[PDB]
Paper text:
Cyclic β-1,2-glucan synthase (CGS) is a key enzyme in production of cyclic β-1,2-glucans (CβGs) which are involved in bacterial infection or symbiosis to host organisms. BaCGS is composed of three regions responsible for the following steps: initiation (covalent bonding of glucose to CGS), elongation of linear β-1,2-glucan (LβGs) chains, adjustment of chain lengths of the glucans, and cyclization of the glucans by transglycosylation. Here we performed functional and structural analyses of the cyclization domain of CGS alone from Thermoanaerobacter italicus (TiCGSCy).
An asymmetric unit contains almost identical four molecules (RMSD, 0.3 Å). The shape of the substrate pocket of TiCGSCy is similar to those of TfSGL and CpSGL in that the substrates observed in TfSGL and CpSGL complex structures can be potentially accommodated in the pocket, although the superimposed glucose moiety at subsite − 3 is a little too close to TiCGSCy. There is a sufficient space beyond 2-hydroxy group of the potential subsite − 4, which is consistent with the fact that TiCGSCy prefers Sopns with larger DPs. Contrarily, W1394 is likely to block binding of glucose moieties beyond subsite + 3. Taking into account the result of action pattern analysis that subsite + 4 should be occupied, side chain of W1394 may flip to make room for substrate binding.
Numbering used by the authors: 1011 to 1584
The structure:
Amino acid sequence: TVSQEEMEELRLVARKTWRYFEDFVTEGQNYLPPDNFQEDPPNGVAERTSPTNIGLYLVSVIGARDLGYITTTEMVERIKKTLDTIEKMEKWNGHLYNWYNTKTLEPLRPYYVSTVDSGNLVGYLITVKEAIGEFLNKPLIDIELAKGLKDTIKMLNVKGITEDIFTTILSKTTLVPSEWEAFLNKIREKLLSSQDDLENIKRLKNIIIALKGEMKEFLVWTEFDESEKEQEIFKRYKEVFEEHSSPKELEKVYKNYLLEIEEVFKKATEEEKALLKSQKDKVAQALEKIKKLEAEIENIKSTIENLVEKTEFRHLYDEKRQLFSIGYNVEEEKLTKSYYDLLASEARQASFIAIAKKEVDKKHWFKLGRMLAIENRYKGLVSWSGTMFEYFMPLLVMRNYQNTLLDETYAFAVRVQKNYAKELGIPWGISESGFYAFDMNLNYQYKAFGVPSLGLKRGLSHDKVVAPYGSLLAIGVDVEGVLQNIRFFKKEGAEGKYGFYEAIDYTPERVPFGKKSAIVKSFMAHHQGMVFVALDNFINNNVMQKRFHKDPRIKAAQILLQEKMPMYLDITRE
């Protein structure tokens, strides 16, 4: 069990991690996240993005709202725009390409379609589809938007603006808009006075501008002048405006106030009619906006659903090997030689969604290579690399059922990975990450760092590159362990503006002499996403998972994860 103090830290890290997207997903990047931002070598923000990057941002957006880092409106918006962009991008049989340029929105040079990239993205979309609906009956003013600002405040740090400020508001199971209006303005005021870094101040203003923004627009019952507040009609509806702040709970309250305005408009003074008329006219638009919000949502859900059923996975499957190829090389109009011949592989998310879409046989799932490695007692599927990501990238959306083959394995991985790492005295979670070497232009290189045990086919080496993203991608399992790693990462200085730096390179060959560890002063959008989502997942009981499985086609197949690990196994040969 996690202490409130503990959680608060995890939440802050989530906030810092979300910031990546806040900051680098620009109009200019066509509302896509760019692969990475490099700090120390300050080459800045790389203007390329992968299907996966994009998907993880979209599900992160949802995740943002979950923690209270954006508003219901803000949410829908970013998704709308990002999707508008997606609906543009040069596709292949309804697939996104390997890479696009964030500005040219052009397929990048080695015109390629990655199976995994598509597979992941599709999943992340399906997740968003089943999720976004929820927010039509989830309050525009809910407590989480305050729990959220708390994290925002801790992060931004601007004088008088301190954590304790909250206390009261957060002490209540519910947030009552009046208290909120007050609290938001109180904070607006101590900001006008506090003379910290104008820049830092600005952000908190705009993040308080955003919060009142939703409220003024959608809860216009705050913007009725003292004479309008008198109209008896208002004094019946006062406690029902406070008791209901969801877009549908408002849609209903707002009509029933607009039909009652109409009724009592005949039995009213010309003074009472002018005041009743002002209130009709405001609450009218306020409804028209809710109708639009509801619509923009369905358009999203529909647009997503489409883009998914448009994605022809058929094309990346060698029917004859009953197996998924790495991806399609568009330049030789040929499918790639090698394949995802293993269950323990990010490919599963691809492999699963295919069967769930009924694009390949339910059998495919069982043709994927299942290899156990019995280490000490614990047994578990080996992967092609040993990267935590190979095992846990699915677990963002793909569920885990207890005692299942996967389950045994998901634990197995954490153990071996933590042993390997304690036996090297580095924090655990060695996975595909950047490391302290650079191309001619001084950009951190990025390579597959497994543990060679879980690494069916591995060059061993010292390659001691611990990436935090991999550690956190398993919060689910050894929360205790991951927490330790996080402290250990802070002490080794991996803490930064946008959460945890890409990786720490302990590798002898590459560490600068008279130093141990070369922190890869980088933030990679895809990894940032995984961390963010994985945190949300941990905090709100595998939410994103339960949303992905809210999809019927997914629920159709959900039994495949409930595969149990066999009790007997032959050993002979021929």
